[PDB]
C-alpha cells in the first residue's frame, strides 16, 4: 500500500521534510556517515548486512562506507524532490525497494533507520516534530517491503 | 585503473560537465527518460538486461522505467557533486559499479550510454566538446567494471 502510505505525507509533513533537508542534505558526506555509524552503534546486528563494506569501525575513513553513505543521501534527495508528485514519489520508492527486497530486508529491519535519523536531526536542533515527519517518509518505503 | 581515469578530469572538463549538467540536470525526469529510450532505440541488444522494467516502449507511461530513469539521474547528480574531491568521486563510482558488475555489465556495454548522452546534449545545443567531457566521466565508471 505505497500510495496509501504516501497519503500520510500531508502539506505540513512535506514542509517539515523540506525545511529539515535544507540543512541535513547540505552536508551529505558528513550526515550520511553519521547516519550509518549511528545505525551500527545502536543496532549492531544490522552490520550483518554490510560485510562488503569491511571495517565499518573506521567510519568516514572507510572509503566503501563513505561511498555507501553519500549514495544513500542521494536517494533521500530523490525522495524529497518528488514529494509534490505522488506518482513519481511512488515509482522511485518502489525502485529503491527492489534491491532491499532481494537482500531480504523486512519493513521492521528497515525501520531501524528511524532512530539514527532522529539523532542526526537533533544534532542539528530539529526536534520530535521533524523526526515524526521523517518516520512518515520512511513508512512509505516500508509499505513497499 | 579508476584512480588514473579520475585524474583525467581536468579543470576544463569539470567545468564543461557542470555547465551542461546545469541544463540537463534541471529536468531529471524528462531527460532521464529520453536518455533511456534513446539507449533502447539505438542499442536494442541492451533491452535484455532490463526485463524487470517490462514494456520499455511505453516510455514515460511505464512507471518502472520512469522510476529507473529518475534514479539514474540522481547518480549523475552524485558524480557531479563529487567533482571537487577525487577521493569522494572514486568511492561513489566504485559503489555504483558493484551492482553493475553483479549484473555482468562490461565496460564496453556501459559505454553504450555515450551515444544517448551525446544526443540528449545536442538537443539542448551542447556539442561535441560537451559530449567528450561526459565520455571522460563515463570512462571513470568503465575503469571500475
Ligand atoms: C533511509 C534509509 C535507506 C535508504 C534511503 C537506503 C538507500 C540505499 C541505496 C541508494 C543503496 C544503493 C543502491 C542499492 O544497491 O540498492 C543502498 C544499498 C544497501 N542498503 Fe539501503 N537504504 C536505507 C536503509 C537501509 C537499511 C536500514 C538497511 C539494512 C538494515 C539497508 C541495507 C542496504 C545494503 C546491505 C545495501 C548494499 C550495501 C553495499 O554493499 O554497498 N539499507 N541503500
Ligand atoms: C550514465 C550511466 C549509468 C548510470 C549513472 C547508471 C545508474 C544506475 C542506478 C543508479 C541504478 C539503480 C541502483 C542499482 O540497482 O544499482 C541502475 C540500475 C541498473 N542499471 Fe545502470 N546506470 C547507467 C548505465 C547502465 C547501462 C549502460 C546498463 C546496461 C546496458 C545498465 C544496466 C542497469 C540495470 C539492468 C539496472 C537494474 C534495472 C532494474 O531492474 O530496475 N546501467 N543503474
Curated annotation (Swiss-Prot), chains A, B:
It comes from the Eukaryota. Heme b binds at residue 100. Pfam families: Globin. The keyword Glycosyltransferase does not apply. Residues 8-145 form the Globin domain. Its main location: cytoplasm. It is found in: Cytoplasm. GO terms for molecular function: heme binding; identical protein binding; metal ion binding; oxygen binding; oxygen carrier activity. InterPro entries: Globin (IPR000971), Globin-like_OT (IPR050532), Globin-like_sf (IPR009050), Globin/Proto (IPR012292), Mb-like_M (IPR044399). Keywords: Cytoplasm, Heme, Iron, Metal-binding, Oxygen transport, Transport. Homodimer. Belongs to the globin family. This is Globin-1. It comes from Anadara inaequivalvis (Inequivalve ark).
